[PDB]
RNA sequence: AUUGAAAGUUCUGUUUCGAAGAAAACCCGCCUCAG
DNA sequence: GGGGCGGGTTTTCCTCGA
């Protein structure tokens, strides 16, 4: 069932990328993907956005029992996503799940949008 | 009868859309299962339905028939192929409804004389005494060939914007490029022949006189389908089609060629044509092949160069 | 009808853009299926959308109509082709919305006597009584020739900086070079003719009077497309264009010339035109060819030198 | 309009630079598609961006305007062409931002009465009410002539050392030699004319008064581009330039001369100019040719000797 | 021996990633569908490691984790990382390329291991800075 | 394959030239080559470096037991001793390799990748033995 | 036939180099940027070969490498060398000069081949003396 | 001639505007092909 | 008789709006 843990970590990555970029476009592309090409392109582009936030020190890992979290600073707003970001192995195992069923991209997109919406509402 | 299998190559195309979601227009896709050494893979591949082709064929037949003076219905002169289905449709044209079952044939003939499209295309009338007529042309779905271990088809989304001086303007369209193959059947022998048992009703002599012209028009209407005048979104997304392989068989008995999903599908259909003529006691069997991708053909086939020669030979 | 196929050679080009990532401006790219001696392959190649060509054609038509005294819409006077889609446009222009289906024709005429752009390029109104008018000019995506095994196209990124005396200014621009090909179609027999079926409505006499001028303006407007006045980023990235091959066919029956993908696409289309005229019972079929690369043409074909001569011949 | 095509010969050149790797300074290179007797090929050739040419032209225009008393912006007085893009520039100059769309014209006029550079080269303001103004001068990349089968261009690296008495100082510089060609366009009929649609605003009388001087300065500013005062690294790598061929066309209608890629591009453009004037119903078409390589020109063409005579004739 | 080769390739990819601070080569390696893509990454990562060796920012060492284990020290942007294990030999690269010519799966396996090594080291380094 | 043997012998030549010169510049030029000119220039320049090492007796062919004897090349550079296992290319190998390059410059990248792998493994082993001593 | 001409020119350059013990003519040939430099070397190398022929220190022979191959024996400073192949004809020199008038690249190709022949022969001769 | 017979989800739209990788730097100090 | 040595680059900016 680690499949759900992998999907949850991918959803956290998408939610961090959405909150930092203030753009739903990558989550929309991920949730509407019909091929491994579209999913893999979004996985790169969202990690490239997260990499810029890391280099600017606007995205950082933290703890908030203590739970792992990711702090995101965007346009003077502060957000905190609870959970881990995916590992390289999670991306590889998720891409294998997508090669079997692109449904998992829709599931991760739905979770990512739920995380982002709850944080934006708060 | 006439049977045909045709292979197409289309690039940067969007002809058959589907239900729009949000601000996006989506293409029509179907699932396929591909065999690999590791196992099986499920892939979504674009397709084109068999209703747009029928609509294009009927429109072309209307255009050709109105030039030669053949009768055309009022609602069919306008590109609205409702046909003589309900009472409201019959009211405009001016045809009395069938009385009972025994009179049904008569009604058919009357309809068969007031609209050519209702004859070749076929019609259905719902009511107390329904009448039926199966279409004389049969078309199938356009699906790209599943040949080898790779599917030569893609599907991407394109982003478009409209410019305004007072912003207060964004849409997306799906485009594809595949290698399509499709097959069709036509029975020119049954044209202008009623399809209901009974006794002959006055007015069949006109149908006998018009049989030749109707057959010629029906054969001529295939040129539009074989030339690529189907689908929609041609104003701004006009595609680029091309012909690769074509096999057409003319016989006097039921027969169909092999699907164009393999690289060698002409030799098989020629051998099967010979074998079927051997068993069904046929007399006429002719095959015309157009080859552009350099695949193996066989022996005993006339080789053409264009589609116009095919239509001329079919009419002859 | 007037159907044309044109080949262009463009170097250091960026006329069409898409969404940008970071400090990089990207060029539109599309997948293409190409045939090689080893089979079929899928590649990603830069392309140019046909909407830019349509916008350039409509702007040139607006300019010509304003110069020649033909009516031009208020919103269309400014280069904003929203046409009559929304209610705000109708309120600005001052045209009442259609009441029922029977009034739709009247509304169409009211739209058709005020803006030539709506007449030529078609329009849409959505509401209780939707009104549709298909464009009379059809274009497609601009794709480089898929000849041989190597695609003659290339794309790269270029580095640019902005100067400043107090650093606190760096961007990248995508540039492509290719040999583009595209085809177009224009049916001049339906210009200034209503499309919605109905009864006669006052005001058609003016349309009949202005039909000749509208057709002449529509034919003249093709000069901008055939010359190379289209696309954006022309202020600092002006491209180098050079015509290489052009085929134009004037017919009274539907016809489509071969795409400019193979080196021999003029002889084939001329032979196909002759056979199509023979088989479809036509009465007019003329061809014009402009050649600057020394490829095979054929026999009994008019040869021109520039594009202005072609435009004059089409007008005459 | 004034449209020109110019050919230059440059040796031991490095005016444009790109990102550096290690101790090597690289020269800008771009892909080009070239036609040979064996087909089409792709090559990598050094090029020069058009932004440097635009910067040189704008600097010369600044100098001329300051000498002739025309107003020059505060930030544009220093050679930093940020124009009025950001809010800091507006605060420094002292111009209030536009409030709504209806005020945009006023803002444009306020920008247009303070800096000639914004008027000629256009500008952009992004915000609640964006304001756009397209440049009135259009340039492109400088590409060597793609004549024959061999490209007349070469690039190499050179070795340099810095002397020091206490070693603890080595670099490489890229140097190119080629025969460059480029084209330019300038429409002087829209100088000192507002582009945003709206109502009359006080201050247009001053623009009408200064229109002649602005046009004269814009025409004079082309001397720097036609002479060879552009590019960087001129302190130690001063290039050797020599004019070879120049064509200038003055028309009242849109026109584009042929690129300087073929040896015969003057006769062709003169014939095309004559036919375009005939077909487009023009009223003015003049041509000037400067030739120093003894190639075919034609008949009935004015022949000049230097560039200053051309500038004087254009001014008169 | 196949697992040892894959582990040494994963160590090379992890060292190259930690030194360059870029995942791009590991992404290319794990998504490879041809021997061309794998071989290109094997060159480019070794070229990055070669620069780190010449700058003395990448060095082989031993570390006590009570026996000495072979390790590679990496200095990048003032961060210090230590990857435990050997770098691949020329024979390991050649035998790995032969494994890739049979099945490109081994590139995905090495990429997954390399990303795991890099992630664990980056997490530990961020935790020590926060304390 | 004989093509792989040729590429391996070219890689040994590049590795010997790199270890003797202590410069990666020729291997970098070889692996980045986009023309036969660049490849051929490196093949000359590396053999010219190897020729100097031969004349100085700092480059010599030998056999080494790794229990059968394998052909090897000993290289002495700056007081470091290196041993590359394998043969150097013949004139026929250079000519056949240049013909392979005229068909596909990919083979220069393959030889460069192998040469850098040989040199890196030898340099790592030499540094480890110095740290232990 | 172009490769055969280049190979015969390379044999001439290798014979001239082995006989003179000087690389100077091969260096001049491989660095040539004009037909003048190439033609001057073609004369000077043939003039060296002519002296070796007159002294009977350069001779054509056949050698079994089990079929007989054409070869050139060269005696220089008590060393014996054997170059396998033919020397160029007058027609080969003329056709080679026409190739050089089209592209000086062929001089670099012949120079690279000549140096390869000479290096292989010098290496083999030094190894036999050490044994 | 089969839950079969009879049907287009089709029409209308620029990701446009603007911005020099620029400044500094020696491959140079020593050599007869000679009797 | 088949050369030697010292050098293998430093800053500054990594998109703005609908």
Swiss-Prot record, chain A:
Coiled coil: none annotated. GO terms for biological process: defense response to virus. Keywords: Antiviral defense, Toxin. GO terms for molecular function: toxin activity. Changing residue 28 to A: In strain P2 protein is soluble upon overexpression, behaves as a monomer. No longer toxic when expressed in vivo in the absence of CRISPR loci A-D. Probably oligomeric upon overexpression; does not interact with a Cas5 (Sso1441)/Cas7 (Sso1442)/crRNA complex. Forms dimer and tetramer-sized oligomers when overexpressed in the absence of CRISPR loci A-D; the oligomers are probably responsible for its toxicity in the absence of CRISPR loci A-D. Part of the aCascade ribonucleoprotein complex, minimally composed of Cas7 (formerly Csa2) and Cas5a, which binds crRNA. Other possible components of aCascade in strain P1 are Cas6b (SSO1437) and Csa5 (SSO1443), while SSO1399, Cas5b (SSO1400) and SSO1401 have sometimes been seen weakly associated. The aCascade complex was purified from strain P1. CRISPR (clustered regularly interspaced short palindromic repeat) is an adaptive immune system that provides protection against mobile genetic elements (viruses, transposable elements and conjugative plasmids). CRISPR clusters contain spacers, sequences complementary to antecedent mobile elements, and target invading nucleic acids. CRISPR clusters are transcribed and processed into CRISPR RNA (crRNA). This is CRISPR type I-A cluster 2/Apern-associated protein Csa5-2.
Swiss-Prot record, chains B, C, D:
It comes from the Archaea. One of its GO terms (biological process) is defense response to virus. Changing residue 160 to A: Significantly reduced affinity for crRNA. Keywords: Antiviral defense, RNA-binding. One of its GO terms (molecular function) is RNA binding. Signal peptide: none annotated. Pfam families: DevR. Crystallography and cloning were done with strain P2, while interaction experiments were done with genes cloned from strain P2 but over-expressed in P1. The aCascade complex was purified from strain P1. Part of the aCascade ribonucleoprotein complex, minimally composed of Csa2 and Cas5a, which binds crRNA. Other possible components of aCascade in strain P1 are Cas6b (SSO1437) and Csa5 (SSO1443), while SSO1399, Cas5b (SSO1400) and SSO1401 have sometimes been seen weakly associated. Csa2 is probably the major RNA-binding subunit. The Csa2-Cas5a-crRNA complex also binds target DNA homologous to crRNA, probably forming an R-loop. Purified aCascade forms a filament about 6 nm in width. CRISPR (clustered regularly interspaced short palindromic repeat) is an adaptive immune system that provides protection against mobile genetic elements (viruses, transposable elements and conjugative plasmids). CRISPR clusters contain spacers, sequences complementary to antecedent mobile elements, and target invading nucleic acids. CRISPR clusters are transcribed and processed into CRISPR RNA (crRNA). Belongs to the CRISPR-associated protein Cas7/Cst2/DevR family. Subtype I-a/Apern subfamily. This is CRISPR-associated aCascade subunit Cas7/Csa2 2. It comes from Saccharolobus solfataricus (strain ATCC 35092 / DSM 1617 / JCM 11322 / P2) (Sulfolobus solfataricus). The gene is csa2b.
